[PDB]
Amino acid sequence: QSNMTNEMFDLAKLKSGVKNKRISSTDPTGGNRDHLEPFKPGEKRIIADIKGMGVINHIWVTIAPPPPTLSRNDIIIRMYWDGNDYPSVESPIGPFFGQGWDERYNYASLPLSAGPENGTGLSCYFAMPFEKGARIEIENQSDRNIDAFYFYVDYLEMAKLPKDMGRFHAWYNHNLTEALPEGETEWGVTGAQKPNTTGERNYVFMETQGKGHFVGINYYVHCPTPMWYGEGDDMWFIDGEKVPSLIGTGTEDFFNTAWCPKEAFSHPYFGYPRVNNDIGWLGRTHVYRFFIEDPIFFEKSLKGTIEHGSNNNLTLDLSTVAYWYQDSAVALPEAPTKAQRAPKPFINHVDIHRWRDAWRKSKGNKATLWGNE
Amino acid sequence: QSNMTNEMFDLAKLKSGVKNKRISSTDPTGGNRDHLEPFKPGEKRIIADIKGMGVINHIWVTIAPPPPTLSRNDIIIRMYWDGNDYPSVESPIGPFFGQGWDERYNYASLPLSAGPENGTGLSCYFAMPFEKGARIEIENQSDRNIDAFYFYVDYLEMAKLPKDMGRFHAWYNHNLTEALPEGETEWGVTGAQKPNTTGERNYVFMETQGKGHFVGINYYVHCPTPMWYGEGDDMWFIDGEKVPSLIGTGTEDFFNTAWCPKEAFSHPYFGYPRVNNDIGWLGRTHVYRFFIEDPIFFEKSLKGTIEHGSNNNLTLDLSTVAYWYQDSAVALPEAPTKAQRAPKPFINHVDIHRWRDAWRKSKGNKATLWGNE
Amino acid sequence: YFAMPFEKGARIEIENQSDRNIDAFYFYVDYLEMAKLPKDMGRFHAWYNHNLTEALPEGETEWGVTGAQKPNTTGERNYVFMETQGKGHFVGINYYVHCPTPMWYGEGDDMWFIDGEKVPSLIGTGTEDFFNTAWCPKEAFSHPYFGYPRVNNDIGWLGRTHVYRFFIEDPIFFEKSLKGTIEHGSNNNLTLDLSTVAYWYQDSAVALPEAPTKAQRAPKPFINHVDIHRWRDAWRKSKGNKATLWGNE
Amino acid sequence: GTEDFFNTAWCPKEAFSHPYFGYPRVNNDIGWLGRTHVYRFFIEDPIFFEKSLKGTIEHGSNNNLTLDLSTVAYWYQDSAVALPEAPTKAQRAPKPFINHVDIHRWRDAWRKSKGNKATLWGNE
Ligand code: NA
Ligand code: NA
Ligand code: NA
Ligand code: NA
Ligand code: NA
Ligand code: NA
């Protein structure tokens, strides 16, 4: 028999052992109230409770009111596989679907998109297998109601889950990173640069034990300086090795870009859906990269890290969502609190004028200092 | 007889006692070398030497090479009336025609314009009367040649100059303004604000003795802070009065605008042909206002001033060209030197990162300082 | 908004020279009736002209690219946009050029002959220069007195450009006669489809030259990629048809 | 046709993007004068061969045109094999853009081929 194969060729093949199912917020009366009842502040609800074996292969969500009225940073999505009492997916729902902070913007990637109206249509095509059921939970951590929650959870019921199917995991992390004691010595501008010989101060976006593969990252940086935020290298520790086997060259480099960019760009596997649009790199940037053709495999463990500026010199407000598969459904590290992951204010002309004043006083408060001395 | 009058009605009236003349860089051989011979660095030349009585009423100029190769800040135009050995017009030619620094950009006002190609076509419609001749001089203060200087000087020869005709004056000034000893306390952000009751430290754009009226100002600000540069009031001292009779409210206010604007805008009498296009008001802004319907009259003297920030608190790189008429051709103050009027570098992300570092040090270098503390 | 005085009446006529109907003609003619017209009021004149200008016998030697340039000391072959006898002043020009080459069309100087003088007293430097612009521009631009309301939007300066200049603050006065001219390329070397409307005042209402006919003033087709490919073929033949000629030889 | 082969039609000169084909750089000038980059990937639809393959394209209909053409071809085969000799640096140097001065010279040759009549428009 011919070994011919590819996406469109295989689509033409008849498939066995699959049955479509869908859980949605459809009005059970047949009327047009096709959303769930409101969520009060703090309320949690299991929106999908599936029994047996299957594979989720399409999720769509929308929420009312839209941002900024209701921030999607403050609505949590959690997923529990195989009857476990811990979630294997835990993230603020906006960041999970590639919508950072309390913002909204259209973008499309192969697994995740936020489509019209202006980033409110959330869709996910990651496949999520399960053997002993699946539960999807929504938690309202906002101070106001979720007036209407709309969704589709499309999945294939299977009499027998194939051999070697993994379990989908996703974890949101956040850190307000610590500058070096000598200060933010990026590019050696304010002081001498030093080597990062351990990666111990790197930001950690993923850390797990098991067998599997890493498949994606949504990276949300809020930079409080106009200085370039992305000199930092990605560094991966596979299966408990002491020296990281995968070491990068820069953050834009890791995201398949170059030369300190700040341009919107779209590829099915990587892109910049939101750029800072200000002096230098001051403000917010969202970058993503999916490792679909090129996952990062591990047999025993994986620790995915990235420098926050060269040798971790910069103070950055960083949040990430990491996506991966592993052999069984495992627990995640404790989530950041609502207060910990709150979006920070944009540095503005008043703040920078105060920096200029401190700088002028450090130079003897000479009446004709330009600013480049 | 009817007293009907207006611009288009009066244009239809036959005129007496005028004859067109034109001095131009036309090729005297009839060939197509319709520009003057090159100017070496430092070279001066009288480009127009008119005898007798007349009124210049249209000037056009262009120069090769164009900016930034050849800066029009470093080519001086001077005009001498009535056989005087001093100029009554003295300015870098770009700033005289509304092209600041070493830049080029299209704009149109009623008396002055810089038209296509991208601001290289310079035109002037101010009327310039003279009774005992006129001399127009060009000086190359660049380090390279003026390869080709093109011009038209259109004027009306008159057998009798009407007796109340004034003399056109224009003066370029430049200052790197001095901050207050306590620093740049704009908006009271870095420290307490204090009153300016005298205008003693105001920037001076015009000062003269005679009878006449002020008709215009080109204002070129290069602001080295993102802070708003224009809280400063215009203040005019007419006929040696101790308290200024005309006191304004702000710089954008004086330029018929409001609320710290940074948008391109065009009116025959006022506008913003070049805006800073960066964080806050950091960078370069060109603003103009012509006082055609509303001149500032004086019978003995005029001193035109403006604050450089409220109570002159800011360090600004400021240059101006002031335009006016007075009863006779008078002398001007010494011109700024080439070094004094040199364009300043743009403050950039590296400079501001150094300000941030001095500011972090002033706050005790807490490792997670955001920037708004 | 031009003011148009008259002492013994005024008549405004419309003529349809199209092959189809004018379905609807709308207008306002606002005027001031005066018991006494002030005595120094002139009369408004405007004249449309059109020429398909003739290249020099040696060809279109603009910029000395195809051959040596020669001086124009007389203005003999210049395009004429206005010629009249009387006392008055010129106040404006609408200039409509259709250039059939990508070469810059505007090296030509304006040249004015006032009151029958033998040597023109007003001589310019270039067409864009005369229109208060510089450096072979092709950008839309607007000033109350001058501008480019329609630009060629193609390679070089191939196609149509409309330029205007009004002489309101700075009219060109004359006591006996005026002849307003402009070169069509330096030393009138170029073939240009040129039309103009000249506007002026003079002491009495005078006659105009015969108008161009409908056929004479018909818009010309735009030179296109097929035409230029045919030029390339004749040029390749002139170079001996080397199989790899690029085009800049 | 070439645009046809690149899944387009009607002599296009518009930027366009598909995962398998597109125009990332278009000529932006009169007609099709200047530079165009087109690509097509045969991922779902490769061109298979058991023994050999020769991939060719006409340079204008019946190869009538002078074009400056360069290509990169990508493929798989059963073993690692050698390639033809590379063009030299000088051979693959980018050519100058034809400009208004060059075309005015073509116009002059064309006018002289038509008897150098003073009122030739250009479409005769
Ligand atoms: Na429904
Ligand atoms: Na329904
Ligand atoms: Na190490
Ligand atoms: Na690096
Ligand atoms: Na000339
Ligand atoms: Na000439």
Ligand code: NA
């Ligand atoms: Na004020």
Ligand code: NA
């Ligand atoms: Na000329």
